[model samples]
Target: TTTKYIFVPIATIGCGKTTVFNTLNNLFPQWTHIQNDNISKKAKLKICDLTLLALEDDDQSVVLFDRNNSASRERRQIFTTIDQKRDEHLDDTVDLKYIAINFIPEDLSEEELWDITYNRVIQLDENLVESVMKGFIQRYQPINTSRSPDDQFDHVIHLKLSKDENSLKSSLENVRIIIDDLVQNFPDLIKEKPADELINECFQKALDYKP
Candidate 1:
């Protein structure tokens, strides 16, 4: 029995990660896509804790962690303290693969980013966005080569989303290539199933049912 590779996306807010994730979900249904936001909402725990639990679980092979390593370090420090009190819970023996996706659109100036953040906060409601942003700002730690060994993220994919056509196309193409390579590289981890078609049909049905 072998452990499957994990792909974690490291990016700031308003980085258009969800768009790329949604596309991946449509393309590869067999791969489980877990969003930190949803996990936090349901588990009533911080994203870091939820991720630890998910990693501990042996059920899922390929896990896509949509979390920021920089932010997670704070929580990891807390976990270290907690573990000192109790026994070390998560299996530290497991080798983790870290993939970082750094994509900030070039057209987005500081002012534009602030406006987008503000409008998003308003549209999603101020309180919720405020709480999440608070966590993001306070906790985020940028992924780097020095921290790679300790963090257990073997691979880092930096996506540069400049305002040029070539850059945007390159980003999209890179995603596809990664997916294809992952599928070929780890066939056993990801089952051979019609995930794309099934997910598409499910999405269609959901849309039709919506008012």
Candidate 2:
């Protein structure tokens, strides 16, 4: 039987969240996949509207918000919005389902993660990469299974992706390239209102990924 779910792929840097999205996009030709570099605060705040819009169609769609939602606050906002929308549409034929998955670093160390991040990313900025990743380590919050913002997730999965260097490098790099390409073409998806803040946010996030 076919199933429909609204999945939020959460993870820190180098954990293969993008790989999951890429794999699913290929698996289902009609899934609505999106990117979120936090592109802008407005963009972050507007996803609920976009998601609701996507769901307006008669057929179910797997609208995946490909955002690096590592923090509880960020994750909560989207979930809350989804809940509110669902309540408003209570009479619909089918109800949308939400699955929260964590793409945390299972057995990989900092060095391995850094290497994966390096490989996954297209351009290499040795100095920048070195400088940017520390903050995430300091402030990144992994799902506790005891947290509040995430308590609403019905069927959540804590993914421990393979740390096989060869496979990870190959698969992750390929997916990263495709994600960048898609984002480039969909420039409007990431708004620029708070461009500087969002850019710094993503950069720091890449540097500080713990999961």
Candidate 3:
């Protein structure tokens, strides 16, 4: 039997999900990262399907399902779909783990979220209307770990969101925190830490990606 992981992000638009995903993928090439953004336009392939396909390769130990899983329903869909179809894709003996990487911390207020996401998305996305981002914020349901879908997570990693230069620095710090947490909590999965410079290097690459 072998162990694999899927890092599911509980985040919204412009919360550095892609940056973190890119950085992790660069650092650990075995960990595949898939996103709905890259899928073909008007595509039939859903994020859940892409995730399963990515994990089908024996060498892929971990997958980053890069999306704004801001709603409890979305979270439920992930666990439900994976549980239903995991056997169809991989061996029944495979130990598939789900980790929730919460980008919006408990302390962050809704106003703060709007300030951060609105400004960030305004700069990154060209055609996105203000209401689109606002709708995501309005619909976002904070993950209640005591509940069904969230409780299903094997582990949860909390990260912060900031504005301006602080945002950039915070993202770099988040990368380090993620790496250390994985090493300490899942020693069998991530055996060692990378060089300090490499973390920055990879993060920079991710930041500059498609810019």
Residue-wise C-alpha lDDT for candidate 3, range 50-117, written one tens digit per residue:
78888888787788998898999999999998888888788888889999999988777888788888
lDDT of 1 by residue, 114-190 (tens): 54444543443567676567565444455544652325545555565433334324445545545555556556643
RMSD in angstroms, all models? Answer: 6.8, 11.8, 2.5
- Ordered from best to worst TM-score, the candidate numbers read 3, 2, 1
- Off-target runs (Cα >4 Å) in candidate 3 are 41-44, 120-131, 163-165
Please report, in order, the local distance difference test score of every candidate based on alpha carbons: 0.50, 0.57, 0.84
Task: Write model 2 residue lDDT over 1-211, tens digit each, in one string.
Answer: 2334577766766666765565645444467766665446756446666666666564645677787777777778877877777645334556566667666544556565555555544433567656476455434555554668777665565554444555444444444443444345433322222334443444344434436
Ranking by lDDT, best first? 3, 2, 1
The numbered model that scores best in lDDT is: 3
| Model 2 bad stretches (over 4 Å) | 1-4, 38-45, 87-94, 105-124, 162-164, 167-211
Best by TM-score, which number? 3
lDDT: the better of candidates 2 and 3:
3
Q: Identify the runs in model 1 with alpha carbons over 4 angstroms from their true place.
A: 39-46, 52-59, 68-94, 104-142, 148-151, 165-171, 180-211
**Which clashing pairs does model 2 show?**
105-211, 133-207, 136-208, 137-208
